[PDB]
Symmetry: C4
Subunit: 454 residues, 4 copies
């Protein structure tokens, strides 16, 4: 029963690799897993079948979590076995019942603190290849465990980080606003107190930038994201890293006596403020709003802007060719800009007279207006409405993932401050092992009231 | 059966405190209440079990109404007991039936005029802690009772108050429009007739302001609203009070020879006109429209404006920093205003040339335009659509609450004019008490036709 | 069985007055009507029970049609009685069946040509008091009968009228465009050919105007609409009449040597062109579009414009009061206009500097912008979306009514050209009356294929 | 059983002509077809009943495909007959089953390569008279066959054509941008290298134009589209042809020494760029987007623009008539343009003062603004939203059709390069004909896993 194949998969691992998350498949695989587990316990009480690992080091539970098999994962996490001969195999227990009320216990053996591959760590840190990682956290124990971790200690840390980032952005804004304008950099210091404050702000800004640089580096090293996972998943890390890059380039140009550094700085500044939006994930409504913003950017703007740019460039080339210029609108950039103005409600239908045929010019402009302003923009609004109607629940699930990742990252960072002081659940005696010893587990109690059962 | 616990709750009070408004819980609690009531009546006909009150003075009916237990409340209000031995316990009666037609009577023992805690008074005057106070008024007797009170006498009073407020606002507008401009206040009177009219208008405006001041004071004293209930529920009272405050401050500044009083006055003026919207609750369609307006303000604008202000401030700081100024757009206020203009369709992409790098400026502006004008605003429209699709019935229920509160407040104010002349239902003989005396109750007849029963 | 009450209602009339269009009520009343009819036919074959009329002259069928009882009407129109003893009472017949195919006949006794109160005439010419007159025409015979009348002869007449109105509007436009400008009216004629054409156009325009005047008069006389039905139902008749009134007033002023006549004329002109939209009811898609336009105007614009005008007037009064003027924006009309400009995307936030406090002015303007431009307009778009989602089928039904009214009016007008040449259905022998004579009826054949029955 | 009627239809053809795609009709016709086929095979094994063709040359399968009978077509393509006596009549086979897995084979006898009327060719090349040609391709074999053809060889060809068209458009743009401006055409050549490049670009542009001209010609000849099918179906072919026409006219005018050629050229240029959108059908998301664009143009813009133009012309005539002009706004074109500006957010409410009555002018303008800007445009947005909600699946199906047509056209064009090298499926032995010989067919294998059957 403990035999391993070439890859190291055991019968349990094989069942897990089989499942495709179909209802019939899920029921059949769960039944087969339960039967095999019970039979093995009857045959070999001493041996542990779930502890066995494949060549990759993944247990059946971790394998199901990594592979996206929500049905098998849900079955395992909530497994209950009422057989007196083998109750140790179950993960879910009823501590007591006061009639309508009931108190249950969950195991957390490798949900939270498992040394190598914790299930939570595995789900949050996935690469999106899995079909459904958003719905995985919805199972009963994980959701409540994460919320407990959030309400206990991570919320205050997140709020502190948000406050610090706000301060940093304010310092950067003030320092950039009062930059010197006379001469070339670097600028000589003065005994003026305001100059000392300005220099202090500059130094703090640079320090924050290099800090974000190194944090992005360590994220890349630690998470070893794939190229796709780099493009599709880690948007915030990339944005913060790019902001830091702009700052560092600004420093380089500043000490290289070039004046272009301002450019870099301003971009960084702008992006910084936008990146404040990252902190909307500590709040449910605003986090869901920001998820919606992300989805709209990815889908609707991308499509609309492809088409709009095609049309704009075509009509701009036509208009510029028509123009003779015999002021100076005979430029592609100027004409593209003048036609873009129609989109923000500031279009002049008479922005030049340097042409030989007025009807052609007018016709082209009105075709452009009808195609972009009256059709494409309102069409975009419609599509946004459809998408909003569609992504009500996916946005909440993605927000829950984002918060979970935040929780895990914070909990890792503050190992030194508290390695195991903030540990979830409590150590409780559950029963007796068939060997006769006590059974002590790190359980997570839940209270549930059922009127129907009585 | 009449025994009381430490808090004073009786078995009925305990059942009421138990209910959570679940279907199974509701059915079980209603059955238990009916069984206990019948058994008690059989055991102790003389004693009254519902009259007993807890330490707080709340009866089971008032307790259910206050706590938001719609199921128990609905059961009690429409209780019918066909047992010949105990029919007095029922609240709903059939006066007669002409075949398809039937005439029923409701009791109104403490629905309307109950001295201490009337159920209507209790529901309307709630603090929103209850899960569902909007659906409570939907029960059969209360809805029809409120509509009868509205159609009988309160509608004319509401219309009169609306007319008077319109006149007041017109007087205030005319008086403010023709204010003196030469010198400092106070302004010396003249024998000109127009000046007498102006002074008359000023005095009437001040009187209205102080009246609203005192009305807000008495509302606060009487309703003793909690801090939350002050923030979340009493928007109109706050708005009228603030308008009065602006007027009073204007008077103070006017007699203090300061010229700033105009500022205060205009704000009051503006708010006054907006507060006219409060009178859309006498009309169903417009009241529901105004409820929708409230909800949109609370949710969609708040979220949108958070995000929009973040983006605007960031890009404004970036643009201002880029600007050198070597007119005078090198100000944060001016740049924020110029960028806000893009939002109302009046943005100039060439509002300054005092910069060293044009590409940076152009890129920043177009990023701002794409992020706010093309994404956020249309996104907002989409979200408004979703919300509208969602709040069709909640808005009607909230309007019904607003009208109910108006009815109760009016009915209280005009006690002197008619303490009990306008009382709902009529005194009718229903049957005979088990003691053999007549049973006289203030009943509210209803007519209902049922073809199925025959 | 033929006895009449004080109002003249017979048992059938009484049943009809009973029905409330509930499913149980409908089934029970239909069953009772059928039983009473069969029993009466058995008792008194010679007498006719449906022919009997109440004091008002309305038969049970016409009474049901007028009162809005769709269930009873549908039962009567499609009544089939397979009893050999009494088959004459049925209105629907099967001429033959070729297996899957079947051919049915409908009676049309008083659906189309009934002298006093034809059912079609009665439904189309209703006053909207009936709960559902839109769904009435959906019954099987009436829909197909109306479509036959449309496809046979009325479509060409409608197209001809549309062409003539287009010509009239073109003549009016051309004549008004080339009006004289030198002096006061009336203008002396000239031998110039263009002047003769201009005068011809003027005369034709006046003739069309007086024609529409008299047509509106005769409509009012004939239809005797109630005050409500005048306000709520006959929009097109009112609009055409008002256009004619403007034209006639223009003539009066023109021969009264006043120059103001132009004003009147232009209004008429404008309304004329808009009234061309009336001819979108000959086409399904455009007719439904125009119905939607009507509904939006009635509901969404009305509500929005109430609120918007309140806000605009309030903020305009505030701004005007703030202004000192020590150009000349110190007018209520100018300020209201400048603030309305914000709504069409042309608002200037710096349209005056004649004030003492800039912060107050700016704050007021931005409050106005946020309340009207960012909330109310987008809110309106959302509400329009909800309404569109709601009125998909009602618009089609209302279009069908509009077309039906057009058909009836046309068919009445052209009695002289063809009194009975264009009559629907054909005279066919159906069977034998119990007296033994032939049964000849004006039937309307239909073909229907049913695979299930076989 | 093989007897033919006057038109040549056999009993199978008659059944096919009978079907109306109703569920009961579909089941009954499929059962009758199967019974007749089995009985005929039992009676006449040697004869082939499906091979028989009507006078038009269409077999029952091709007849069903052409006529739009999706039910019969689906039955035939997936027919399975497990009777040992006659298994040859079936089209769908199970090669093997490994438990949960199964491998099926489809016949492709005349789905792909049938000489005269291939089913795929027939469905793609339809004239839209059929009720549902979009859903036809959804059947199991055709969808997978088309996707295989796409993934195998046509995708690269499509990408190559897209690249070539992009290059052509770039060459045309560059050549047109640098056109000579001094004198009249034709322009004398110069030894300047840039002039040689310009001439090369001109020649290549003309060659592309004449190529598209001839391709449109051959399409018209080959497909022999009907007048309707020309108006309703072949939009892209028409657009490319019109672009070529503009180019050719430009050449004609250029060598005719006329200067107007530029006009033609620019139009062609513009349309060229827009026609790049045709290549969005190689990508699913963008193809569906472009289908939505098409539908919106056809429905919503058409209706909106009818109504909007009516209103604009009416109010423009009114305003122009009011104007006296005693600059020069007394023109219909200028006034129509100024009023259209209100639509793109650039309307001036004070664009002239040459009138005698200001109130009339203001009233007309505000009526126009309210009717077009506040009602019609937002109404349009709402309608777009409804349409988007409605056409989610139809757009995907139409995209699949467009891609299928592209596949077929490409596969026809490259017959010379590979007549039968790229043929779908493979030749496999299926069984034995009743004559005892082998049965070899061009089958298309599919793999399907079913857990329920086991
Ligand atoms: C916490 C945020 C604190 C800063 C917030 C806001 C900045 C407030 C500055 C406004 C002062 C008036 C402007 C003026 O005339 O002085 C200018 C002097 O230049 C400055 O004032 C530069 C300010 C640098 C800020 C870095 C903080 C380091 C300590 C921590 C020019 O003269
Ligand atoms: C009921 C509403 C009545 C008011 C409605 C409307 C106000 C109408 C005023 C228009 C008059 C022409 C302006 C003019 O030249 O005279 C000005 C005189 O100043 C005024 O007319 C001030 C008006 C004060 C209104 C308070 C009402 C008190 C009695 C109740 C300046 O000279
Ligand atoms: C069918 C519609 C026919 C009209 C369509 C269109 C009107 C065409 C007129 C354009 C002519 C050039 C303008 C010009 O210089 O002449 C002007 C002469 O004034 C006119 O031309 C006035 C036209 C009156 C139209 C009434 C039709 C009566 C017969 C039927 C001024 O000199
Ligand atoms: C692949 C797309 C290649 C072209 C892309 C882009 C066009 C690049 C041209 C920019 C050059 C600078 C402008 C300048 O001063 O020279 C002008 C000379 O005129 C031109 O340069 C005309 C270009 C014709 C292009 C046809 C390609 C034929 C070979 C293949 C005027 O002096």
């Amino acid at each position: 029963i403990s035999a391993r194949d070439s890859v190291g998969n055991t019968v349990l691992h094989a069942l897990v690799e089989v499942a495709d998350n179909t209802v019939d498949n899920t029921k059949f695989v769960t039944s087969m897993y339960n039967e095999i587990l019970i039979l093995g316990a009857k045959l070999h009480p001493t041996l542990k079948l779930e502890e066995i690992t494949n060549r990759k080091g993944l247990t059946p539970l971790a394998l199901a979590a990594s592979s996206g098999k929500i049905g098998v994962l849900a079955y395992i996490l909530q497994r209950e076995i009422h057989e007196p001969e083998c109750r140790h195999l179950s993960r879910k227990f009823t501590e007591w019942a006061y009639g309508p009320v009931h108190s249950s216990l969950y195991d957390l053996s490798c949900i939270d603190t498992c040394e190598k591959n914790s299930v939570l760590e595995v789900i949050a840190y996935s690469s999106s290849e899995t079909p459904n990682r958003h719905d995985m956290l919805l199972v009963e124990p994980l959701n409540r465990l994460l919320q407990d971790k959030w309400d206990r200690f991570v919320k205050r840390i997140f709020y502190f980080n948000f406050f610090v980032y706000c301060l940093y952005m304010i310092i950067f804004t003030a320092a950039a606003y009062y930059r010197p304008v006379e001469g070339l950099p670097p600028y000589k210091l003065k005994n003026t107190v305001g100059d000392y404050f300005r220099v202090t702000g500059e130094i703090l800004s640079v320090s924050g930038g290099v800090y974000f640089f190194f944090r992005g580096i360590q994220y890349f090293l630690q998470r070893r994201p794939s190229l796709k996972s780099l493009f599709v998943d880690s948007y915030s890390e990339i944005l913060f890293f790019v902001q830091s890059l702009f700052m560092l380039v600004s420093v380089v140009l500043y000490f290289s006596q070039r004046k272009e550094y301002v450019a870099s700085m301003v971009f960084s500044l702008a992006m910084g403020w936008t990146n404040m939006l990252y902190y909307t994930r500590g709040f449910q409504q605003m986090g869901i709003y920001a998820v919606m913003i992300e989805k709209m950017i990815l889908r609707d703007l991308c499509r609309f802007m492809f088409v709009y740019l095609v049309f704009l460039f075509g009509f701009s080339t036509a208009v510029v060719t028509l123009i003779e210029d015999g002021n100076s609108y005979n430029s592609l950039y100027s004409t593209c800009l003048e036609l873009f103005k129609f989109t923000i409600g500031m279009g002049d239908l008479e922005f030049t007279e340097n042409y030989d045929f007025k009807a052609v010019f007018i016709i082209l402009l009105l075709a452009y207006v009808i195609l972009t302003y009256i059709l494409l923009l309102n069409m975009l609004i419609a599509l946004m409405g459809e998408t909003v109607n569609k992504i009500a629940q996916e946005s909440k699930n993605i927000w829950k993932l984002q918060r979970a990742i935040t929780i895990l990252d914070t909990e890792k960072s503050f190992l030194k401050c508290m390695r195991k002081a903030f540990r979830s659940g409590k150590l409780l005696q559950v029963g007796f092992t068939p060997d006769g010893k006590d059974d002590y587990r790190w359980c997570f109690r839940v209270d549930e009231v059922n009127w129907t059962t009585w």
